[PDB]
Design a protein around this ligand. Structure first.
Ligand SMILES: CCCCCCCCCCCCCCCCCC(=O)OC[C@H](COP(=O)([O-])OCC(O)COP(=O)([O-])OC[C@@H](COC(=O)CCCCCCCCCCCCCCCCC)OC(=O)CCCCCCCCCCCCCCCCC)OC(=O)CCCCCCCCCCCCCCCCC
Ligand SMILES: CCCCCCCC/C=C/CCCCCCCC(=O)OC[C@H](COP(=O)(O)OCCN)OC(=O)CCCCCCC/C=C/CCCCCCCC
Lengths: 53, 62
């Protein structure tokens, strides 16, 4: 049952990572947080653009 | 033009002038300061509508 379990968990992790879920863990692969606020320098974004007609 | 300032006085007699412009019946019940309240209070009401401008940039609304 140990081997049966790690087969399902390997499929569950791959499926969970495939979904577009909100970030649950604090830190991603790096030590940095996975929030929208975690945008530091370098500054490379221009002014926000308006709506299109 | 100096004679135009006295136009409404020529059609009237003196007793009619006093009863018209001098002897206004006392009525101290009106809200006279509503003129200032609507004008100055409009700054606050204008801010309610102005704070919802769809301007995309935050510094443009600054
Ligand atoms: C059906 C679809 C539409 C079809 C129709 C389309 C056509 C529509 C137009 C015709 C119908 C209009 C109806 C009213 C008739 C008025 C006609 C007129 O000529 O008025 C000119 C009017 C007044 O002229 P004014 O003598 O120069 O007074 C302004 C001075 O600044 C004043 O400065 P002040 O120093 O002399 O005095 C200070 C002032 C304070 O004033 C200020 O401080 C504001 C100054 C502006 C910001 C300062 C920066 C200056 C910016 C300069 C550049 C601006 C250029 C814009 C040019 C636009 C040209 C139109 O305080 C006051 O004087 C008193 C204010 C409080 C009195 C009560 C006001 C009640 C208003 C109505 C309430 C009910 C409406 C519902 C609430 C809103 C909806 C949620 O000028 C304006 O355009 C005012 C704009 C204010 C924002 C309006 C936003 C709401 C618009 C309502 C639209 C309908 C409701 C939404 C429907 C949504 C679905 C469609
Ligand atoms: C659903 C109703 C809710 C009403 C609010 C609930 C609270 C009720 C408690 C009220 C208790 C009444 C006590 C007496 C209050 C006295 C009111 C008063 O002094 O008004 C004076 C005075 C009358 O003027 P005069 O003719 O010079 O004075 C004559 C005096 N006999 O009134 C005014 O100045 C007019 C201003 C009235 C208040 C402001 C009205 C505007 C409020 C904004 C909301 C309206 C939205 C829609 C407006 C349409 C615009 C296009």
């Amino acid at each position: 049952i140990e081997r049966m379990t790690e087969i399902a968990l390997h499929v569950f992790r791959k499926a969970r990572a495939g979904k577009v879920r909100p970030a649950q863990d604090v830190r991603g692969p790096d030590g940095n947080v996975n929030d929208f606020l975690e945008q530091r320098r370098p500054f490379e974004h221009p002014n926000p653009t308006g709506v299109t007609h | 033009d100096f004679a135009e300032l006295l136009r409404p006085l020529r059609s009237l007699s003196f007793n009619q002038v006093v009863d018209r412009y001098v002897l206004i019946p006392p009525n101290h019940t009106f809200y006279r300061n509503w003129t200032y309240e609507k004008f100055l209070g409009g700054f606050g009401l204008s801010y309610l509508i102005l704070r919802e401008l769809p301007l995309r940039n935050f510094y443009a609304r600054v």
